[PDB]
């Protein structure tokens, strides 16, 4: 697909030992040519997987709902089932305000107390509660992911 689009005078190699990790060093070994051609080379990278940590505090109100319902609603919002919200695509920052908005649009008539978030490198141990924040700016070459069990909820 990448080899279909080319300009004729511009190389594709990229990397500064800190941006998105390339799949392979010298080349991704593209096909030579569908018809009457020889081998060509081109380079592409992939984003850096991340894990997000969010704290939510809520009051039941007058109707009781299991935490797993809210958790699943949030996580399958993160993939973007609903029109108007693309999701956590490459180079997309994450803010607790938009998470609260997704919750509200998903179910009205409920009260929200607090919502703070954090995000660190994937594979690291769970951080302390002092590592959370309202919004986490995330890099151009980064990808953020979410997990159902990763999110911890408090039904005060």
């Amino acid at each position: 697909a990448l080899w279909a689009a080319h300009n004729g005078g511009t190389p594709w190699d990229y990397g500064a030992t800190n941006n998105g990790v390339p799949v392979d060093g010298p080349n991704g070994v593209p096909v030579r040519d569908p018809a009457s051609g020889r081998k060509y080379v081109v380079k592409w990278t992939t984003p850096i997987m991340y894990d997000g940590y969010v704290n939510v505090t809520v009051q039941q109100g007058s109707s009781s709902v299991a935490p797993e319902a809210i958790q699943n609603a949030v996580v399958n919002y993160a993939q973007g089932k609903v029109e108007g919200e693309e999701g956590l695509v490459v180079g997309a920052s994450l803010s607790a305000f938009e998470v609260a908005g997704a919750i509200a649009r998903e179910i009205p008539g409920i009260y929200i107390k607090l919502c703070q978030v954090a995000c660190v490198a994937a594979g690291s141990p769970a951080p302390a509660p002092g590592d959370f924040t309202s919004e986490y700016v995330m890099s151009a070459f980064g990808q953020a992911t979410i997990s159902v069990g990763n999110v911890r909820v408090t039904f005060v």
Binding site: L2, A4, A5, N7
Partner: protein, 156 residues
């Protein structure tokens, strides 16, 4: 004479527009890319026939296979006393038909000749069936003009 010549001249008054058809448009689209004809027969080889002895199968016999496809033979041949010969087939319509690898049925019957049957050693030649009449040509031109519309990044 006057009416005929005047109507004929009015027939091809405008042709450069991609609305026209019938050969002039064939050339206009081949200016970029385009195939025509594409109307062959599912010609075969290595037929299977068990019959009586020292008899001749007449040319242009009829053969039918289970979803009622009509197939004619090509060449006339004699049968050796063993009861096995190779035949050549052709289809009624100029279409890319699909043959089911099953023992066939007979429409036109010679004497003492049965078992129109497949063989997995038979050559299979898939024919075109007037694959591009008039409108898919415009669709292809539209697709290619959409392709050339994009710039470097948007195309990627």
């Amino acid at each position: 004479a006057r009416s005929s010549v005047m109507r004929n001249e009015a027939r091809i008054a405008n042709t450069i527009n991609p609305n026209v058809s019938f050969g002039t448009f064939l050339d206009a689209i081949c200016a970029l890319m385009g195939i025509e004809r594409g109307s062959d027969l599912s010609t075969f080889g290595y037929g299977v026939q068990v019959t009586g002895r020292s008899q001749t199968r007449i040319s242009t016999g009829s053969r039918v296979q289970t979803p009622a496809g009509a197939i004619f033979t090509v060449m006339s041949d004699v049968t050796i006393p063993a009861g096995g010969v190779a035949t050549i087939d052709i289809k009624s319509q100029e279409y890319g038909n699909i043959p089911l690898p099953v023992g066939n049925l007979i429409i036109i019957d010679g004497t003492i000749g049965w078992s129109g049957a497949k063989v997995i050693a038979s050559t299979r030649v898939d024919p075109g069936s007037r694959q591009m009449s008039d409108a898919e040509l415009k669709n292809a031109r539209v697709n290619r003009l959409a392709i050339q519309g994009r710039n470097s990044t948007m195309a990627i």
